[PDB]
Design a protein around this ligand. Sequence first.
Ligand code: CLA
Ligand code: CLA
Ligand code: CLA
Ligand code: CLA
Ligand code: CLA
Ligand SMILES: CC1=C(/C=C/C(C)=C/C=C/C(C)=C/C=C/C=C(C)/C=C/C=C(C)/C=C/C2=C(C)CCCC2(C)C)C(C)(C)CCC1
Ligand SMILES: CC1=C(/C=C/C(C)=C/C=C/C(C)=C/C=C/C=C(C)/C=C/C=C(C)/C=C/C2=C(C)CCCC2(C)C)C(C)(C)CCC1
Ligand SMILES: CC1=C(C/C=C(\C)CCC[C@H](C)CCC[C@H](C)CCCC(C)C)C(=O)c2ccccc2C1=O
Ligand code: SF4
Ligand code: SF4
Lengths: 91, 107, 107, 143, 107, 31, 80, 732
Amino acid sequence: SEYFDLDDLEDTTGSWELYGQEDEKRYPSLQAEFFNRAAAPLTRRESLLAFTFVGGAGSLLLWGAKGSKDVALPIQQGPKKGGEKGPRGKI
Amino acid sequence: WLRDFLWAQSSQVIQSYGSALSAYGLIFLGAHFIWAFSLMFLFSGRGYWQELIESIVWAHNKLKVAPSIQPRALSITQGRAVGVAHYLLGGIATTWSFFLARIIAVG
Amino acid sequence: IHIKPSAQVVWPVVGQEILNGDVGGGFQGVQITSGFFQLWRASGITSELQLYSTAIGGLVLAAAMFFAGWFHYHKAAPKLEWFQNVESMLNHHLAGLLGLGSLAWAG
Amino acid sequence: WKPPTLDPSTPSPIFGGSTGGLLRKAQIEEFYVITWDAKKEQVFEMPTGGAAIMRSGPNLLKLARKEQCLALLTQLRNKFKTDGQIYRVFPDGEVQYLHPKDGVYPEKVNAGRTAVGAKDRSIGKNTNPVAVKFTGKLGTYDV
Amino acid sequence: IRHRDAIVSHLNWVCIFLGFHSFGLYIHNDTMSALGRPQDMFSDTAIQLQPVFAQWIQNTHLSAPQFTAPNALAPTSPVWGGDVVAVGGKVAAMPITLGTADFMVHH
Amino acid sequence: MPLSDSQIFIALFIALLTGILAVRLGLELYS
Amino acid sequence: SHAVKIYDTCIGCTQCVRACPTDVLEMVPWDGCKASQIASAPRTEDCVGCKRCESACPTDFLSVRVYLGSETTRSMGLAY
Amino acid sequence: ATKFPKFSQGLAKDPTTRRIWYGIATAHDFESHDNITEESLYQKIFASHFGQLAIIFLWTSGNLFHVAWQGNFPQWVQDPLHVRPIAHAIWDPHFGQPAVEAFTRGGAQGPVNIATSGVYQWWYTIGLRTNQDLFQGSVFLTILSGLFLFAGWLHLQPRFQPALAWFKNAESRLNHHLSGLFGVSSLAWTGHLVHVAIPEARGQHVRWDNFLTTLPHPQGLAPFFSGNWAVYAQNPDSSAHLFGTGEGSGTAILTFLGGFHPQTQSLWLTDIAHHHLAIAVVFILAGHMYRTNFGIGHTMQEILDAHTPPGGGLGAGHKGLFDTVNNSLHFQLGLALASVGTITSLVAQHMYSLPPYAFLAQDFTTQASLYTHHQYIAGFILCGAFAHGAIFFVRDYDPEQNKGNVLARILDHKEAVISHLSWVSLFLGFHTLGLYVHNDVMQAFGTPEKQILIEPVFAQWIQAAQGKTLYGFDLLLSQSNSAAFSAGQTLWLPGWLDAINSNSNSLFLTIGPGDFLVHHAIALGLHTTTLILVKGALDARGSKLMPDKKDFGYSFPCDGPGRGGTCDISAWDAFYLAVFWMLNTIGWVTFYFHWKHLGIWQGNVNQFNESSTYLMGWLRDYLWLNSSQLINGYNPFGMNSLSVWAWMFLFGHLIYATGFMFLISWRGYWQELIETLAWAHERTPLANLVRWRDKPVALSIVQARLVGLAHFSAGYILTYAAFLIASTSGKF
Ligand code: CLA
Ligand code: CLA
Ligand code: CLA
Ligand code: CLA
Ligand code: CLA
Ligand SMILES: CC1=C(/C=C/C(C)=C/C=C/C(C)=C/C=C/C=C(C)/C=C/C=C(C)/C=C/C2=C(C)CCCC2(C)C)C(C)(C)CCC1
Ligand SMILES: CC1=C(/C=C/C(C)=C/C=C/C(C)=C/C=C/C=C(C)/C=C/C=C(C)/C=C/C2=C(C)CCCC2(C)C)C(C)(C)CCC1
Ligand SMILES: CC1=C(C/C=C(\C)CCC[C@H](C)CCC[C@H](C)CCCC(C)C)C(=O)c2ccccc2C1=O
Ligand code: SF4
Ligand code: SF4
């Protein structure tokens, strides 16, 4: 019998935990306490979106304005060979 | 691949006219045609064709030339079979003419 | 080394005799790519007479195959248990078809 | 006749399992149960793939779709000459009896049934779609 | 039949992985070449993908008459290594080396 | 003769105002 | 859900009901045809839209019509 | 369930990924939205039209701004034949240094794109000269876009919402659009040409700060008011005039010279001014035809009801058609799209042969790009015209209200129309393909003298009647003593006959048997595309296979495998099939334009004349021969500025091929595949921690046809655009 109406609908529908185990004690207390106070302001979904937005946008424009120049991207050096020559005497 | 194999090596089949290899140039073109022809069977569906045949059958009925064996569009499965048969024939014969003209002329 | 194999000749009509290319050996025809010449040379065939003999013998055997298909359907049709002798068929096709075929070809 | 109750103590057929059975939908949306009474122990084809052995006497089988239950029931009726019952089971424990809805198979006409979807006209008498613009109806068949 | 979903899903993943890591290498190369970055390409003169297993197989089959097939005078084919076989001033067979392009097309 | 920086900033500011009006129209069309 | 409407040309042949793979249709008593029955569609929430019923119908034109509508889990034939 | 398709509760309750796709695809079908009324539908359309107008003006502002900021417009103005016009700058961080060097062109300080849109020639012709002029125009158009957006918001407010009856006032809208939107706009454009563009063509710098000080004509407005209008035609610009300078210039402002300015190879600006002035007067007059609020003018319903032949040849005639057209937005959109798309084709045919902008004819890449662009746009628009005709027949057509009129009567012999379209398509295809294949076999067998080369004597006779003396037909404008000749001899015939008898322009090109064959291919394409579209529109309401098709709507997948099978039976599917044929037809048209002009521009007309009579000639001498520079845009030896077109060429081939997957493989294969994938995710550890919100399903049948067609079309267009621009610009 693989069916039961009440108190075994979890077994009937196969709602089992194959690998998850109940456990409260995994990490050290000071390590955990450190990481809860580290990630405390980002535990709100609006704050993390604001933080990732501001940081990512600032990193991207700082890369574009300055960082791309520092790593010497070819688009920031520009041409040095005077320009490609077109046909029919066109410039 | 596109330039140095397909574009460069097709020079023999497309210059084959007026030589004994001209049959390969003609088959190259005809196989391109048969391949393209297959796309009408693969991309369409028989409901359109049956309705078009209804109008054509009206024209034959008006002139008393409607056949007794009632014309139907091909079945859905036959439409697929015709499409894949002409697709394979056209593509493979294209490569056949390309290969044979190329390697006979430069071999 | 210099002569291109050819075993198909077209008739002169509607200009198609251009396909009888100058393949060498004082001969005009369509160049073949099936490899028969190399196979006939490896077999030791040196003349058109031996090619004629194989062609005649093949047609006789072709008639024998068509006779057998008519015979084993219309005159002496094997029963189902004959076909289901897979052990006998494997023994005969391994030793008799492939084995004696390879021995005779080695001969 | 009254709608039967799903007996949860019914045994299941002998099956080695497969990858084609129930998924998370059975836990959170719905699933289905087909029950039948077998005259003898015999092999039948699962609608989810693979051979299974129906036990002699009452059998119970849980399936993901109503169509799977009706496919198995069609096999039971046409190959084994066996009738069956189909239920819909909800995650809250509610069991809804589905088929045959009034105890008689739907292909057999039965008194007490009322027509729904009947139109008192031939199909060519439907009105034009311009006549149902800005009315909220589903189409000309809806009026 | 009872685990067809596992078979088909695993094969689906294999096909997606193979398509990405075979055709996307070509797309990477076309994009790098168009952008004027041949040093960023998958090539024999850039980021290399050498088919080292097939190269080792070739070396093993070349060295076979020495040790592992002592009574065979020569390897089975010139494609493994060694000298050009020339007939009538044309190459009959020669070693077929395998580099990055061969890796890419085999995948 | 090239444009000035101020001309580019003028064009960008007028485009920002136009974009605000566009967002206003899009929201009005929505609801 | 799909809408399955029945019309009055139905000859009560029951073939559409037998064809239905999800038990949408059933035969109910009627006086409009010789067979004294008509197809009915009480369970269109289970209709997948396969139009096996229309393929089974012998009348010209059809007496059972399926109008594909808003899609649900049942009408999409999903087991997941 | 969700709230994204808030206009459709049926889509909002869909638990699958189909809800998102269909929510996007049905967003602009306002008539099918939940709880929509006719008045709110019209108001939403009015505001959407304001939004589209604002987008158009912003797009034009962006083109002007990027040319002013990053282009080389003053340098091009100095040397229009030897400067490549710059579209905009490139800032791509993926570029290598060779790509940075290769794309630096036109005298720019960095990598740029060279424009193919012809805006330099147009803006220079209409009098713009500096970067400041372009910038001021761009700022003005951004402000215009803001005004349009504000008006769109404003007329959605309840006290400014127009009533439904205002939208159905046809007579007032036609009066105003003809008189003001066409006529007054053309009159104001004549004002711009006379006050600004013509003086700037003569070296006179006229702008906002001095145009009230500058005399457009030396005698002012006295010849206009007195009626002595021939004063304005005296002393035109001479044949030795240098454009943009006072050397060789005249003082005329309204002329009828005909033909081309010898230096710019374009139409005379004074001719253009007189054209737009006459157009202004004709359109202002035509805008006084219909009755509004003053007791005079025509009533269109009574005009239509009056036009029924008394012999009964058209039945009830046009009776009731006013309400049919006026109540159906799809009839109106179908008419608008048919007319606008035909006009787009007319623009394409007339701008290559009668170039209106200075130094446009010498810019070969730009001319080819503009012709191809407008012909493909015209093809898509014509497909849409017939699509909305079919939609009208399904959704809006009332047979009782149209009893016996021309619409009902053409529906009543739809089999005759469709069967005759089928016959003409079959005849054209059989014989055009047969003649081409015969010629191909003749060339293959070494005997080109056995080709069937039919001389296009009818079109050559037309060219002779318009004055081309090359063919020896002496009639009308090619007969020096004819009445038609003598009438135009002092006005426009000298310039016109100089232009039409010169082979150095595109005005009525010399034609021969290759032109015959390709024109019959074009006729085959037009007739077959029309056959598919017309059969779709006329069978939209029903056919013998599906007599109740109107009950199912314009677009639906099929009616199932019964009755033999009914794939692609909807009118939408006829649109989908016809797009392939339209793309094929415009492909043939544009191939013809480009190859004939390639021979003319390279100074070798014999290549087209000899090779176009057989299809190997097209393949080898057009596609294969001209792809050589394009596919060498990047190679193992390096890259050049054509590498972007080589990459886009391959990109288009890839997108085209990807479309074949959606078009060839159909739904149920993918649905079963996705079922196995959904099993795999639920059973995979560390991945089944995440779940989908929408149940993944295969794309629908119709959606697949759409997506496959979109990939096919996009790949088609991208491939040909890359080939066209690369092949023309690598030589020129
Ligand atoms: C060139 C044409 C083309 C392409 C690209 C595909 C694509 C695919 N086919 Mg389809 N197919 C085609 C033609 C094509 N087909 C045609 C004409 C038919 C009709 C017969 C089919 C019928 C068909 C069947 C029956 C099946 C496929 C399957 C597949 C997949 C193989 C797995 C794979 O390689 O994933 C990798 C994807 C690619 C290699 C495509 C290119 C991806 C690029 C390189 C990555 C780019 C990412 C991009 C840069 C990031 C996004 C950025 C952007 C959004 C801004 C893949 C999705 C099989 C599949 O589903 O099994 C898993 C399958 O069973 N196809
Ligand atoms: C000429 C361009 C044009 C115009 C005038 C409109 C006009 C309209 N659209 Mg259409 N749209 C366009 C282009 C356009 N759209 C393109 C290219 C797409 C993708 C194919 C769409 C897809 C789309 C969807 C899916 C929806 C609209 C809706 C709307 C209405 C409200 C728009 C809005 O700003 O809501 C502002 C609302 C928000 C910002 C919050 C909700 C987000 C909405 C639901 C989706 C975003 C809509 C927006 C137009 C997408 C822009 C696409 C972008 C690539 C250009 C309005 C009638 C919505 C409407 O309700 O239908 C009548 C609607 O649901 N549009
Ligand atoms: C003088 C009065 C007047 C004017 C100027 C307009 C102007 C306009 N109305 Mg009409 N309107 C009027 C009175 C007027 N209206 C009245 C009295 C009513 C009620 C009875 C209406 C009711 C009305 C409605 C309901 C709608 C309009 C809309 C429109 C716009 C049409 C779209 C467009 O831009 O076409 C541009 C057309 C031209 C410029 C004419 C030329 C067309 C040809 C084919 C082009 C070729 C010209 C030339 C060769 C091209 C040169 C190209 C260049 C690049 C070189 C346009 C802004 C629609 C809309 O868009 O607005 C929101 C709309 O939905 N109007
Ligand atoms: C001898 C005198 C005479 C002549 C020759 C005409 C001629 C005409 N009148 Mg009549 N008329 C007359 C006396 C005359 N009228 C008198 C005394 C009055 C009273 C004042 C009228 C009042 C009147 C009215 C009120 C109207 C006409 C109209 C017409 C036209 C259509 C009539 C018809 O039935 O078409 C029959 C047409 C068909 C049955 C359809 C044929 C469709 C063909 C087969 C399609 C072919 C398409 C082709 C294959 C595709 C392209 C070809 C390709 C090569 C490009 C026609 C020009 C109508 C009109 O058109 O006015 C402009 C109209 O409304 N007349
Ligand atoms: C190269 C590709 C190709 C070809 C040749 C055709 C051919 C045809 N199309 Mg199809 N089409 C195509 C691609 C093609 N299509 C694609 C990709 C689509 C999108 C799905 C369509 C969608 C489409 C629609 C929707 C319609 C057509 C129609 C037509 C016909 C147009 C009229 C005509 O030209 O008659 C001349 C006929 C031909 C040129 C066909 C080839 C004739 C051959 C060469 C005759 C000789 C055969 C040879 C001697 C036999 C040897 C056999 C051998 C085994 C012995 C014709 C049958 C229309 C139609 O049916 O009108 C009547 C129609 O409504 N097409
Ligand atoms: C730095 C600075 C600043 C800032 C600025 C900014 C931040 C700017 C930006 C700008 C921008 C950022 C702009 C933009 C623009 C936009 C636009 C202009 C848009 C438009 C759009 C449209 C037009 C739309 C349309 C539509 C659609 C698409 C769909 C739906 C419908 C509609 C119609 C709505 C300031 C002043 C504070 C200060 C000083 C410094
Ligand atoms: C389906 C439908 C529809 C649609 C339709 C369409 C889409 C159509 C198209 C159409 C078209 C697209 C048409 C076109 C046509 C054109 C024409 C008809 C033209 C004419 C011309 C002429 C008449 C001219 C003459 C001349 C002159 C003036 C000068 C010299 C030269 C000549 C002689 C040539 C609708 C919506 C209505 C409705 C519903 C249904
Ligand atoms: C073109 C097309 C058709 C129309 C094609 C048809 C009906 C096939 C026509 C084949 C031949 C030409 C019909 C006539 C055969 C007779 C034996 C001819 C006798 C005449 C002598 C000259 C031989 C479909 O029916 C169809 C169905 C499903 C998917 C796609 C398509 C599809 O693409
Ligand atoms: S469409 Fe299919 S599921 Fe729906 S009533 Fe008909 S047969 Fe039954
Ligand atoms: S609807 Fe058709 S199939 Fe069903 S009972 Fe009536 S006649 Fe028979």
